[PDB]
Amino acid sequence: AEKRIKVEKPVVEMDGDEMTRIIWQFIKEKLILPHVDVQLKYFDLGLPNRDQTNDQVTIDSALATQKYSVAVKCATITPDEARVEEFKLKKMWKSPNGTIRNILGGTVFREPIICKNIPRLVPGWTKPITIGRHAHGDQYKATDFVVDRAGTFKLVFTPKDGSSAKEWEVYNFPAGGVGMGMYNTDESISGFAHSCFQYSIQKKWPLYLSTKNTILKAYDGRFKDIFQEIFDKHYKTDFDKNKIWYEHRLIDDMVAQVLKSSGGFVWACKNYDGDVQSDILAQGFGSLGLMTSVLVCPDGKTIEAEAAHGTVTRHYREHQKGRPTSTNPIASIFAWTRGLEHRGKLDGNQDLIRFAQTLEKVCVQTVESGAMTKDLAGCIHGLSNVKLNEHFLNTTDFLDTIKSNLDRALGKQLEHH
Amino acid sequence: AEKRIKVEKPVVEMDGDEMTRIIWQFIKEKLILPHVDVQLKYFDLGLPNRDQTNDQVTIDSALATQKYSVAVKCATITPDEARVEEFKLKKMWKSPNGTIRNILGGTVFREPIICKNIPRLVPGWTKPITIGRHAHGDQYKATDFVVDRAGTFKLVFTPKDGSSAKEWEVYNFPAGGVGMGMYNTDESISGFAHSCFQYSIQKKWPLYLSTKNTILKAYDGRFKDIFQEIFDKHYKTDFDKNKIWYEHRLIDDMVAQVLKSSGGFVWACKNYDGDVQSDILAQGFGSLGLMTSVLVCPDGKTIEAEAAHGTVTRHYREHQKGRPTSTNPIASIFAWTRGLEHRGKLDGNQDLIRFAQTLEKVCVQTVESGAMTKDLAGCIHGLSNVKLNEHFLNTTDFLDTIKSNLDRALGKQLE
Ligand SMILES: [Mg+2]
Ligand SMILES: [Mg+2]
């Protein structure tokens, strides 16, 4: 290609774990840095460094993302019991996404990456669906415990001004059990709502906020109340103007509608439902690998693009020994592209935005032309009916095909001006 | 059946609301009692009577279910803001299904009804899938509240044996917000697990418990642990004998893995997940109306077979104005059959069991042959390519067709 595109402001990079960390490197080397001059603020969120720093690098990386307004994040391991044994960890550390999302706040938007030849497990979904997952609070900022004896679990609220304290007896445990408490601010639900309406306007689509307000009257009612209050006060005229609507729905009614519908709408979820229902969407549209994830913070400027799927552990065992693999890198690629795309919007850099979009176009077209990794070929032909270099190809070979197609596609650009 | 089938012990009947209430008494009058002599213990759980009794009749029906060990429940209204204006209720009463499940406890087993002519929205699922929803606790017995000003929200556990009281600060509120707290006992999780393992063995299918124990390490971890403890102590040897397995899984891995698979397993969900994921299975397998729902208590004897779908109001307004409707009653019929089928198995009554099966086989065959309601027609032809008395029948007509086919099927049996 020509001279590299000069990016004025920096971009935070959060490095990942095991096999997603290796393809992360090959993406920077072959696709990003050859075409883009960018100042990269590095943070290693790999599990070894998190252990060494005591999960402090996770906090510092989030604070850096607040400062420079853009981050890109590779996939990381949230450690279980076996991982503490393997990595010799001093503590079973909490989810780094949880720590970051709590600090930044806002709304995780998730939508599928549409490859026209990839078959859908849900034939009904002709148009694409976007989830707006609430990034803060609920189960991901909870306080849970085990009860080993008889006792009285209660909630207590002590006002700051000094008026008398309120109390609620949750349960008198007769013997052993478990208990937990969670929360959410009005502020975070407001910023969550603003994000979902504004995205619903920009997309020219309707919005649906699912809750379970019939059971949790005070808690889930506050979601429905704040959404309806903001809709009718700010975006009522704009939805009517654009031939679209906002509605609430019951969560168990909603998941039936979605599976039955043709699609083509925004779907606002609470924190927990966003996690569960977005992995249904992804898999229904074709594959877990084909999905984006962009945490849009309430301030309007800040984002954290990231790899949707988890780390590929079994494929990492092969790369240690020096053997080939076939791991789909497209999620990691799109995390980079959406990071640069938003970097460009913030600075008015038109070349950077068009580069990002061109790379997204290429990744799709490459798969559409029958060049793909094993997991995507398994969607088409069946998982045990595919040969090496015939139906699918290796991970670095697939990246080399994208590298090649990117240069070709960038060749058709500028030459016609 | 010139003489009816006698039933030694009683059955509890919980009457419902609006349109299902109408088709409930249709089923009682012309489908059940003509062929079965069964002493029913009537409890009206309609919303007007629940207001009359301060939701006490709801409790009374549960205590009756404990005594006689079988219940059948029509669909009821969980009232919202709009219902308190309409019915002029004194208080916005809580869910009667919530109140009953809390008192009885156990595992709500939900599985689809397979009609071969109905298409599935998930082509992958060749074989059927049974969810085992946990009946008790979690969000359904939660204390939740709104926060109007700044303050410190904390939890407190005060041991009864006089040991040290523990406290956890949850959050220090700057502005307003919301907070809640919930619980679950170890005994509830045991009976839940046992019920799931016994059903998984009797089906000869593998079991999968799903949790989010990476995040809620203590709470969801307790489920993972108790299931695994009970498996290895009691059931591992019988699972191995029938070529089946138990496995834990992460919830967001499970929902992907289920949709990808071709079914044929038992899926043990927690209380909240079972509510949501059962509607995905139902809708995906064909339609919300083609779903059974049987609460199976920890003791093994007691059950409560309920109507899965809600009491759809759209159609009830047409009925009140004289016009015909097209609601699917098959759910409500299966509530009866599964009640009677269990009533028969408890008492050793082979005739009652055969009858219950015959009616289920009739409901399926009736749809498979061609006769069906509007919503089941819409699954095949689409919702706006359907003709009244061509592609579908009325609610009244459909029930008379089932009554006819039941009588002819029963009339063929005696030979
Ligand atoms: Mg996930
Ligand atoms: Mg439900």
mmCIF file of N, CA and C in Angstrom, chain B residues 143-213:
data_model
loop_
_atom_site.group_PDB
_atom_site.id
_atom_site.type_symbol
_atom_site.label_atom_id
_atom_site.label_comp_id
_atom_site.label_asym_id
_atom_site.label_seq_id
_atom_site.Cartn_x
_atom_site.Cartn_y
_atom_site.Cartn_z
ATOM 1 N N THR B 143 -36.960 -9.838 48.104
ATOM 2 C CA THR B 143 -37.346 -8.549 48.663
ATOM 3 C C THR B 143 -36.631 -7.485 47.838
ATOM 4 N N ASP B 144 -37.400 -6.587 47.220
ATOM 5 C CA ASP B 144 -36.863 -5.530 46.346
ATOM 6 C C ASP B 144 -37.455 -4.167 46.706
ATOM 7 N N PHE B 145 -36.672 -3.105 46.511
ATOM 8 C CA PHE B 145 -37.065 -1.755 46.936
ATOM 9 C C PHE B 145 -36.409 -0.635 46.115
ATOM 10 N N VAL B 146 -37.086 0.513 46.068
ATOM 11 C CA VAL B 146 -36.588 1.710 45.394
ATOM 12 C C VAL B 146 -35.880 2.600 46.411
ATOM 13 N N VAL B 147 -34.803 3.245 45.970
ATOM 14 C CA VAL B 147 -34.011 4.149 46.799
ATOM 15 C C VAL B 147 -34.239 5.583 46.317
ATOM 16 N N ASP B 148 -34.769 6.425 47.207
ATOM 17 C CA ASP B 148 -35.158 7.813 46.875
ATOM 18 C C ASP B 148 -34.073 8.865 47.154
ATOM 19 N N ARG B 149 -33.202 8.599 48.133
ATOM 20 C CA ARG B 149 -32.107 9.511 48.501
ATOM 21 C C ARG B 149 -30.806 8.743 48.782
ATOM 22 N N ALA B 150 -29.748 9.464 49.151
ATOM 23 C CA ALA B 150 -28.423 8.862 49.379
ATOM 24 C C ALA B 150 -28.372 8.030 50.660
ATOM 25 N N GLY B 151 -27.612 6.931 50.629
ATOM 26 C CA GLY B 151 -27.462 6.052 51.796
ATOM 27 C C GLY B 151 -26.637 4.788 51.580
ATOM 28 N N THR B 152 -26.399 4.067 52.675
ATOM 29 C CA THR B 152 -25.598 2.839 52.682
ATOM 30 C C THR B 152 -26.492 1.594 52.737
ATOM 31 N N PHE B 153 -26.522 0.852 51.630
ATOM 32 C CA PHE B 153 -27.227 -0.432 51.529
ATOM 33 C C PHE B 153 -26.270 -1.547 51.948
ATOM 34 N N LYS B 154 -26.640 -2.292 52.991
ATOM 35 C CA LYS B 154 -25.853 -3.436 53.468
ATOM 36 C C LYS B 154 -26.736 -4.646 53.751
ATOM 37 N N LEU B 155 -26.112 -5.823 53.769
ATOM 38 C CA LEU B 155 -26.760 -7.082 54.156
ATOM 39 C C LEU B 155 -26.289 -7.473 55.550
ATOM 40 N N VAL B 156 -27.137 -8.194 56.286
ATOM 41 C CA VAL B 156 -26.817 -8.657 57.646
ATOM 42 C C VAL B 156 -27.360 -10.070 57.877
ATOM 43 N N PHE B 157 -26.486 -10.980 58.307
ATOM 44 C CA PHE B 157 -26.886 -12.324 58.722
ATOM 45 C C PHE B 157 -26.602 -12.479 60.211
ATOM 46 N N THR B 158 -27.638 -12.815 60.981
ATOM 47 C CA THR B 158 -27.540 -12.940 62.436
ATOM 48 C C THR B 158 -27.842 -14.392 62.836
ATOM 49 N N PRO B 159 -26.787 -15.223 62.996
ATOM 50 C CA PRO B 159 -26.922 -16.612 63.432
ATOM 51 C C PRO B 159 -27.799 -16.798 64.658
ATOM 52 N N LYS B 160 -28.599 -17.858 64.637
ATOM 53 C CA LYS B 160 -29.569 -18.131 65.690
ATOM 54 C C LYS B 160 -28.879 -18.752 66.909
ATOM 55 N N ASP B 161 -27.789 -19.491 66.677
ATOM 56 C CA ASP B 161 -27.037 -20.133 67.768
ATOM 57 C C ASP B 161 -26.165 -19.199 68.638
ATOM 58 N N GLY B 162 -26.231 -17.885 68.409
ATOM 59 C CA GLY B 162 -25.533 -16.904 69.243
ATOM 60 C C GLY B 162 -24.096 -16.600 68.846
ATOM 61 N N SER B 163 -23.662 -17.098 67.685
ATOM 62 C CA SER B 163 -22.331 -16.798 67.146
ATOM 63 C C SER B 163 -22.316 -15.414 66.473
ATOM 64 N N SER B 164 -21.144 -15.002 65.992
ATOM 65 C CA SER B 164 -20.931 -13.650 65.457
ATOM 66 C C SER B 164 -21.815 -13.321 64.254
ATOM 67 N N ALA B 165 -22.481 -12.169 64.309
ATOM 68 C CA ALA B 165 -23.275 -11.673 63.187
ATOM 69 C C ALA B 165 -22.341 -11.097 62.127
ATOM 70 N N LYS B 166 -22.577 -11.461 60.866
ATOM 71 C CA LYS B 166 -21.770 -10.990 59.739
ATOM 72 C C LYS B 166 -22.516 -9.896 58.973
ATOM 73 N N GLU B 167 -21.763 -8.940 58.427
ATOM 74 C CA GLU B 167 -22.310 -7.853 57.607
ATOM 75 C C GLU B 167 -21.502 -7.682 56.332
ATOM 76 N N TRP B 168 -22.188 -7.361 55.235
ATOM 77 C CA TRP B 168 -21.551 -7.025 53.956
ATOM 78 C C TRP B 168 -22.137 -5.716 53.439
ATOM 79 N N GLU B 169 -21.298 -4.703 53.221
ATOM 80 C CA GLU B 169 -21.747 -3.477 52.553
ATOM 81 C C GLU B 169 -21.844 -3.757 51.058
ATOM 82 N N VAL B 170 -23.014 -3.501 50.474
ATOM 83 C CA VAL B 170 -23.264 -3.792 49.061
ATOM 84 C C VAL B 170 -22.857 -2.607 48.203
ATOM 85 N N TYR B 171 -23.412 -1.440 48.518
ATOM 86 C CA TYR B 171 -23.148 -0.227 47.753
ATOM 87 C C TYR B 171 -23.506 1.009 48.561
ATOM 88 N N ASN B 172 -22.720 2.066 48.371
ATOM 89 C CA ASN B 172 -22.983 3.358 48.980
ATOM 90 C C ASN B 172 -23.610 4.280 47.931
ATOM 91 N N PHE B 173 -24.929 4.459 48.018
ATOM 92 C CA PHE B 173 -25.690 5.212 47.013
ATOM 93 C C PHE B 173 -25.401 6.716 47.091
ATOM 94 N N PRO B 174 -24.934 7.328 45.978
ATOM 95 C CA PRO B 174 -24.825 8.789 45.949
ATOM 96 C C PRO B 174 -26.165 9.438 45.603
ATOM 97 N N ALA B 175 -26.738 9.069 44.458
ATOM 98 C CA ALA B 175 -28.084 9.488 44.067
ATOM 99 C C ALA B 175 -29.065 8.381 44.455
ATOM 100 N N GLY B 176 -30.263 8.388 43.871
ATOM 101 C CA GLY B 176 -31.217 7.288 44.039
ATOM 102 C C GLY B 176 -30.861 6.060 43.218
ATOM 103 N N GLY B 177 -31.717 5.043 43.293
ATOM 104 C CA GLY B 177 -31.504 3.781 42.573
ATOM 105 C C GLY B 177 -32.469 2.679 42.984
ATOM 106 N N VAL B 178 -32.013 1.431 42.884
ATOM 107 C CA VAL B 178 -32.766 0.261 43.357
ATOM 108 C C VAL B 178 -31.832 -0.763 43.989
ATOM 109 N N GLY B 179 -32.385 -1.570 44.887
ATOM 110 C CA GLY B 179 -31.653 -2.661 45.525
ATOM 111 C C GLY B 179 -32.593 -3.811 45.808
ATOM 112 N N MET B 180 -32.050 -5.026 45.838
ATOM 113 C CA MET B 180 -32.821 -6.214 46.216
ATOM 114 C C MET B 180 -31.957 -7.264 46.900
ATOM 115 N N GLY B 181 -32.624 -8.271 47.454
ATOM 116 C CA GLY B 181 -31.965 -9.413 48.077
ATOM 117 C C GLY B 181 -32.823 -10.646 47.897
ATOM 118 N N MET B 182 -32.181 -11.798 47.714
ATOM 119 C CA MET B 182 -32.885 -13.067 47.498
ATOM 120 C C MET B 182 -32.144 -14.226 48.149
ATOM 121 N N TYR B 183 -32.800 -15.382 48.206
ATOM 122 C CA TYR B 183 -32.270 -16.533 48.931
ATOM 123 C C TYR B 183 -32.646 -17.862 48.289
ATOM 124 N N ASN B 184 -32.043 -18.929 48.811
ATOM 125 C CA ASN B 184 -32.423 -20.301 48.477
ATOM 126 C C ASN B 184 -31.844 -21.284 49.497
ATOM 127 N N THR B 185 -32.636 -22.273 49.912
ATOM 128 C CA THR B 185 -32.196 -23.257 50.908
ATOM 129 C C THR B 185 -31.443 -24.419 50.264
ATOM 130 N N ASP B 186 -30.650 -25.114 51.080
ATOM 131 C CA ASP B 186 -29.927 -26.316 50.648
ATOM 132 C C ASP B 186 -30.879 -27.481 50.374
ATOM 133 N N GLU B 187 -31.930 -27.607 51.189
ATOM 134 C CA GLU B 187 -32.950 -28.653 50.998
ATOM 135 C C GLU B 187 -33.703 -28.523 49.673
ATOM 136 N N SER B 188 -34.037 -27.293 49.287
ATOM 137 C CA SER B 188 -34.702 -27.041 48.003
ATOM 138 C C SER B 188 -33.836 -27.485 46.825
ATOM 139 N N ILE B 189 -32.535 -27.230 46.919
ATOM 140 C CA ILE B 189 -31.595 -27.592 45.859
ATOM 141 C C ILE B 189 -31.379 -29.117 45.807
ATOM 142 N N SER B 190 -31.503 -29.804 46.948
ATOM 143 C CA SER B 190 -31.394 -31.273 46.998
ATOM 144 C C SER B 190 -32.546 -31.962 46.280
ATOM 145 N N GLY B 191 -33.770 -31.639 46.692
ATOM 146 C CA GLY B 191 -34.982 -32.179 46.064
ATOM 147 C C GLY B 191 -35.078 -31.848 44.585
ATOM 148 N N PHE B 192 -34.613 -30.653 44.228
ATOM 149 C CA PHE B 192 -34.472 -30.240 42.834
ATOM 150 C C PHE B 192 -33.551 -31.196 42.079
ATOM 151 N N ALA B 193 -32.374 -31.456 42.643
ATOM 152 C CA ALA B 193 -31.378 -32.322 42.008
ATOM 153 C C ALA B 193 -31.844 -33.772 41.922
ATOM 154 N N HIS B 194 -32.340 -34.308 43.037
ATOM 155 C CA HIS B 194 -32.870 -35.673 43.071
ATOM 156 C C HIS B 194 -33.925 -35.882 41.989
ATOM 157 N N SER B 195 -34.916 -34.990 41.948
ATOM 158 C CA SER B 195 -35.985 -35.034 40.936
ATOM 159 C C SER B 195 -35.436 -35.071 39.508
ATOM 160 N N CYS B 196 -34.413 -34.259 39.244
ATOM 161 C CA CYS B 196 -33.764 -34.212 37.929
ATOM 162 C C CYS B 196 -33.003 -35.490 37.590
ATOM 163 N N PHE B 197 -32.300 -36.057 38.568
ATOM 164 C CA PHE B 197 -31.555 -37.305 38.351
ATOM 165 C C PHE B 197 -32.485 -38.501 38.133
ATOM 166 N N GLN B 198 -33.572 -38.568 38.898
ATOM 167 C CA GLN B 198 -34.550 -39.649 38.755
ATOM 168 C C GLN B 198 -35.291 -39.591 37.416
ATOM 169 N N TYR B 199 -35.635 -38.383 36.971
ATOM 170 C CA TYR B 199 -36.271 -38.191 35.666
ATOM 171 C C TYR B 199 -35.306 -38.514 34.527
ATOM 172 N N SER B 200 -34.048 -38.087 34.656
ATOM 173 C CA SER B 200 -33.024 -38.343 33.635
ATOM 174 C C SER B 200 -32.722 -39.842 33.464
ATOM 175 N N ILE B 201 -32.777 -40.604 34.560
ATOM 176 C CA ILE B 201 -32.600 -42.070 34.520
ATOM 177 C C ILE B 201 -33.813 -42.754 33.891
ATOM 178 N N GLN B 202 -35.005 -42.375 34.342
ATOM 179 C CA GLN B 202 -36.258 -42.961 33.855
ATOM 180 C C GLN B 202 -36.529 -42.667 32.357
ATOM 181 N N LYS B 203 -36.080 -41.507 31.867
ATOM 182 C CA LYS B 203 -36.084 -41.186 30.418
ATOM 183 C C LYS B 203 -34.978 -41.889 29.617
ATOM 184 N N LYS B 204 -33.938 -42.362 30.308
ATOM 185 C CA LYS B 204 -32.673 -42.799 29.703
ATOM 186 C C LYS B 204 -32.078 -41.705 28.806
ATOM 187 N N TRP B 205 -31.918 -40.519 29.399
ATOM 188 C CA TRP B 205 -31.324 -39.349 28.749
ATOM 189 C C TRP B 205 -30.264 -38.709 29.651
ATOM 190 N N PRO B 206 -29.289 -38.002 29.046
ATOM 191 C CA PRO B 206 -28.287 -37.279 29.833
ATOM 192 C C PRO B 206 -28.848 -36.001 30.464
ATOM 193 N N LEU B 207 -28.225 -35.569 31.560
ATOM 194 C CA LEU B 207 -28.632 -34.369 32.295
ATOM 195 C C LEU B 207 -27.588 -33.258 32.149
ATOM 196 N N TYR B 208 -28.057 -32.011 32.132
ATOM 197 C CA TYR B 208 -27.189 -30.832 32.084
ATOM 198 C C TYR B 208 -27.729 -29.763 33.032
ATOM 199 N N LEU B 209 -26.963 -29.404 34.062
ATOM 200 C CA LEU B 209 -27.317 -28.270 34.917
ATOM 201 C C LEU B 209 -26.564 -27.048 34.426
ATOM 202 N N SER B 210 -27.277 -25.939 34.241
ATOM 203 C CA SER B 210 -26.674 -24.688 33.787
ATOM 204 C C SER B 210 -26.704 -23.657 34.905
ATOM 205 N N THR B 211 -25.576 -22.970 35.106
ATOM 206 C CA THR B 211 -25.461 -21.862 36.069
ATOM 207 C C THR B 211 -24.542 -20.760 35.514
ATOM 208 N N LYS B 212 -24.412 -19.664 36.260
ATOM 209 C CA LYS B 212 -23.442 -18.604 35.975
ATOM 210 C C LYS B 212 -22.491 -18.500 37.179
ATOM 211 N N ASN B 213 -21.871 -19.627 37.526
ATOM 212 C CA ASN B 213 -21.046 -19.727 38.742
ATOM 213 C C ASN B 213 -19.651 -19.095 38.652
#
